[PDB]
Amino acid sequence: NIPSLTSFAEENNYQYGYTYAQQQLNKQRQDFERVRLRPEQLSNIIHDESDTISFRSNLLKNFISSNDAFNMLSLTTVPCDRIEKSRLFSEKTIRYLMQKQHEMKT
Amino acid sequence: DALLTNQLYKNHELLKLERKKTEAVARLKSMNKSAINQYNRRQDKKNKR
Amino acid sequence: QMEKLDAKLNHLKKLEKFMELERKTLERQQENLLIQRLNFNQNSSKIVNVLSKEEIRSQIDHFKSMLSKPETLSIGKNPF
Amino acid sequence: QMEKLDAKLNHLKKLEKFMELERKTLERQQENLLIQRLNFNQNSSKIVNVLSKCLNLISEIRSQIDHFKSMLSKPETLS
Amino acid sequence: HSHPSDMVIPDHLAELIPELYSFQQLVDSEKRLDHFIHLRNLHMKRMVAQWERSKLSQEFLYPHLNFPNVKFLRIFISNVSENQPWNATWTMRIEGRLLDNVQANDPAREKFSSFIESIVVDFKLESVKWQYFDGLDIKRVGSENVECTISILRKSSPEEPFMSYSPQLTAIIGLKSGTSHDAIFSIYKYIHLNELLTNDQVSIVKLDTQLITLLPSSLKESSPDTMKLTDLLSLINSTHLLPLQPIEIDYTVRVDKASTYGELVLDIEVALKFNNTQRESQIGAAELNENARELEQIKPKIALQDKEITSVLSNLHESNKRYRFFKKISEDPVKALNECIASTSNALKVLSGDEGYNEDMVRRANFYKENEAMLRENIEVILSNGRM
Amino acid sequence: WGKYQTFGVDILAKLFSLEKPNLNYFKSILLNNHKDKKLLRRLLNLYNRHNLLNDVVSFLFSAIPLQQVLSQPSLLIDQFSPVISQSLTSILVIVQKILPFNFNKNLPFVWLSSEENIGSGLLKLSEIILNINNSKVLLPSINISCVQLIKCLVEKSICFENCLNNDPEILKKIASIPNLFPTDLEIFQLFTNPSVDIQIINQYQLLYNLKNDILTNLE
């Protein structure tokens, strides 16, 4: 097949109305461009991450994540002088930067 | 899609090639037709004399 | 860390470029040697098959006998 | 990320050693080229020398053999 | 669930924490490092495959100049002939001497007896063979003279692929010996430089005056036949190749000369199981498999680190959400405390499934005075269709 | 991740097939009725010379998964042959019919030696595709597309250097690409196997004749 560019012309094709070579080329045209342009009627209809995203699950997760983070704010009756600060380094990041600074003189 | 792409690239090259063929074809006709008509007119005024 | 990474990367890339250039040069010199050898042997065989048409019999047979057995080098170990 | 990078930067040394293997192989090919060049030079020189001996002992025809002597007088016989 | 989305720390965190650029261009600095390993691996898959193809070639067969598998061995062609008037004696001999620091009376020496494939001295008295001692001692009777063509076959083991060629092929190729790959490659590179390649297909090859004598017995010198290359490649396999390598020397045993036990020279060399072991086509494959085992050892420690990288990235996004929620409140605590309520009851209306207008908005009368436009449309639409 | 970029390399492959208005508009955009003259000259310098051309060619060198099909052997090329074929067709159109003067930077040189070595990737891909069909429709076109693309990139790099004449030591830097320019042994292999084509070994032998003309002009 792989019919033509002349078979795609408007003269050899039907229009809103109101030969043999044309009716032979339009067989191969409709038999080529209906196995090429047909959509996939099976799975892999996900196509990406941002099509199977769920508004209901994210809305439920945000309803939980706002409620518990607001219960963290108001109901935690620890005064501001008593809120102890967290460490800016870990127990492993403080070992690796003692190791690499020891090995930095090479 | 790949085969029709390759056919789309095939068709442009064929079309470009044909013109310079038919430029040689059409000039072959008319200049020979000129050379025919010159070979006609070589004898035309000859017999008048 | 980024400086040591880019230093070793640049060194390995320059080593790759040098090895590639030397391999290309070796392949070129091998092909040129083979071409020159074919040319020399073809020319010598052509002029000896032309030239053959006493003493000239002995010298022509000497050159054809030397051409019949090309030789190589004596490469071995050192006994003493 | 730095612990991830240091593993590959320790991995690079074997790929460095493969370059030394390639340098060994290229030096061996250089040895081959030198030995084949030496075996070519002496054979070409011996053949052109006994060719000169034949043209010394050999003496539409004269101009042909003199053209052959113009050929093999200098080592242009590769051309 | 390999999400491509959450490998990006796009703008809102990198502007606040400037180390994230120092993180991100770290990761990109890794991504061009591993790719450099990848172009390395396709390099090491190449050169080994380059060398197993060129294993047969003499680029890696004749140079072995660390230790070549060759030991030279000289041979005296001796002749003792006495008891003649000056019974003509014919004590002809062949003596083998290994070129080393070795002696003549050395016990268990690599002579021409312990290590020679064959020495077939073809005499003109009676011809002798050598089926695979301190010397070759031949003596028959006779009177005048004897000439013997001394022929030495080298140790023609199957692991020395350097074989001789035809007397014609040496004149055109230039190699008095070599492998079959040189015999298949030298005429191939000879064809292209003198345009003997033809087209009708690449298989057809014009023959030459130097190529008609390649097959003289096959009768192709009678017709300049531009034939296929297939007949040429099927020609040079046993029509010219593999003579079991002979050396020859012509000499006569003389009637009056005394001896040649210490006077004559020869040149024959030979151990062989070294250079075919440490080849680059197998050492490179062993190094490739070593680096592959090292990659498969180093990979799960990388995967266990990537697990924790993703688990810390998820916590970074979760903490970013709570930082934004705690900052928008602290900036304006009356407008954020109206957006926190109006997006909580609306977050319940959607999750419950209910819909519609706000009940307390449409209950008043100014709603139907500001929406005077759409009601005159909808009342006519419902009345004209007959549903009012 | 998602095949959405593979739709763009077909829009660019089919819209380059007309030398009428399509390729004229693409030419005047990539190289350079009375108000859009002001609009186009406003949009072109709002896009941050010749950033558009190298961006389009570098994106078309993306979506050809060289790293993925060369990491692990026939399934991935049998799945991605149309996108590879149309991407190579688009790059061949841009190389042959757009690049031949207002340039000020050597674009085929910075594509050939951009530390990713896409020419070696195309050569290994041609080796891979040549080692499946002889040992599944588009592959004879893809082989010739790869080899002709490498040849046209090298020749246009040398031609751009001859036109610009600012970097004289590039004949070393072109010949110092670690897996370009296939050796004489694999071409010796290709001239013996009957399962190969005629145009494949023709493109290979003119690539080798380009390789020899590199080394002759080198010194």
Short mmCIF file of N, CA, C and O in Angstrom, two decimals, chain C residues 48 51-64, chain D residues 53-59 65:
data_model
loop_
_atom_site.label_atom_id
_atom_site.label_comp_id
_atom_site.label_asym_id
_atom_site.label_seq_id
_atom_site.Cartn_x
_atom_site.Cartn_y
_atom_site.Cartn_z
N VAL C 48 60.18 -8.03 -14.59
CA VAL C 48 60.99 -9.22 -14.87
C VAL C 48 60.31 -10.10 -15.93
O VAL C 48 60.99 -10.75 -16.73
N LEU C 51 61.31 -8.16 -19.09
CA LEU C 51 62.72 -8.01 -19.42
C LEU C 51 63.39 -9.27 -19.95
O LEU C 51 64.49 -9.18 -20.49
N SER C 52 62.76 -10.44 -19.81
CA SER C 52 63.43 -11.69 -20.16
C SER C 52 63.58 -11.89 -21.67
O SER C 52 64.37 -12.72 -22.11
N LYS C 53 62.83 -11.13 -22.47
CA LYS C 53 62.87 -11.27 -23.92
C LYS C 53 64.17 -10.71 -24.50
O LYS C 53 64.96 -10.07 -23.80
N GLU C 54 74.21 -17.65 -21.46
CA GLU C 54 75.30 -16.69 -21.55
C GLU C 54 75.54 -16.04 -20.19
O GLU C 54 75.86 -16.72 -19.22
N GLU C 55 75.37 -14.72 -20.13
CA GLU C 55 75.47 -14.01 -18.86
C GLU C 55 74.11 -13.47 -18.44
O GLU C 55 73.78 -13.43 -17.24
N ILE C 56 73.29 -13.05 -19.42
CA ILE C 56 71.97 -12.52 -19.11
C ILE C 56 71.05 -13.62 -18.61
O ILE C 56 70.20 -13.36 -17.75
N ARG C 57 71.23 -14.86 -19.09
CA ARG C 57 70.47 -15.99 -18.58
C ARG C 57 70.79 -16.24 -17.11
O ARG C 57 69.89 -16.45 -16.30
N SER C 58 72.08 -16.18 -16.77
CA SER C 58 72.51 -16.40 -15.39
C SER C 58 72.02 -15.30 -14.46
O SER C 58 71.53 -15.59 -13.36
N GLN C 59 72.07 -14.04 -14.90
CA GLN C 59 71.66 -12.96 -14.01
C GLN C 59 70.14 -12.87 -13.89
O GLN C 59 69.61 -12.57 -12.82
N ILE C 60 69.41 -13.15 -14.98
CA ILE C 60 67.95 -13.17 -14.94
C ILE C 60 67.46 -14.33 -14.09
O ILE C 60 66.53 -14.17 -13.28
N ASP C 61 68.10 -15.50 -14.20
CA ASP C 61 67.75 -16.63 -13.36
C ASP C 61 68.14 -16.37 -11.91
O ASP C 61 67.45 -16.83 -10.99
N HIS C 62 69.21 -15.60 -11.69
CA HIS C 62 69.59 -15.19 -10.34
C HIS C 62 68.53 -14.31 -9.70
O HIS C 62 68.13 -14.54 -8.55
N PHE C 63 68.02 -13.32 -10.45
CA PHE C 63 67.01 -12.43 -9.90
C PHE C 63 65.66 -13.14 -9.73
O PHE C 63 64.95 -12.91 -8.75
N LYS C 64 65.31 -14.02 -10.67
CA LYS C 64 64.06 -14.77 -10.54
C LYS C 64 64.14 -15.77 -9.39
O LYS C 64 63.14 -16.00 -8.70
N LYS D 53 71.97 -4.98 -10.91
CA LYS D 53 72.95 -5.94 -11.43
C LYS D 53 72.51 -6.52 -12.77
O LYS D 53 73.32 -6.68 -13.69
N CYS D 54 71.21 -6.83 -12.90
CA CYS D 54 70.69 -7.37 -14.16
C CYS D 54 70.73 -6.33 -15.28
O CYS D 54 71.04 -6.67 -16.43
N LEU D 55 70.43 -5.07 -14.96
CA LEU D 55 70.48 -4.03 -15.98
C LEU D 55 71.92 -3.67 -16.34
O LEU D 55 72.18 -3.20 -17.45
N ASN D 56 72.85 -3.88 -15.41
CA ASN D 56 74.26 -3.75 -15.76
C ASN D 56 74.72 -4.89 -16.66
O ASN D 56 75.51 -4.66 -17.59
N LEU D 57 74.25 -6.11 -16.41
CA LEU D 57 74.69 -7.25 -17.21
C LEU D 57 73.90 -7.43 -18.50
O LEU D 57 74.26 -8.29 -19.31
N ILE D 58 72.84 -6.65 -18.72
CA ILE D 58 72.04 -6.82 -19.93
C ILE D 58 72.71 -6.10 -21.10
O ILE D 58 72.42 -6.37 -22.27
N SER D 59 73.64 -5.20 -20.80
CA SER D 59 74.33 -4.44 -21.84
C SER D 59 75.84 -4.61 -21.75
O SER D 59 76.51 -4.86 -22.76
N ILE D 65 64.17 -0.23 -22.34
CA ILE D 65 65.02 -0.66 -21.23
C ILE D 65 65.66 0.55 -20.55
O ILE D 65 65.92 0.54 -19.34
#
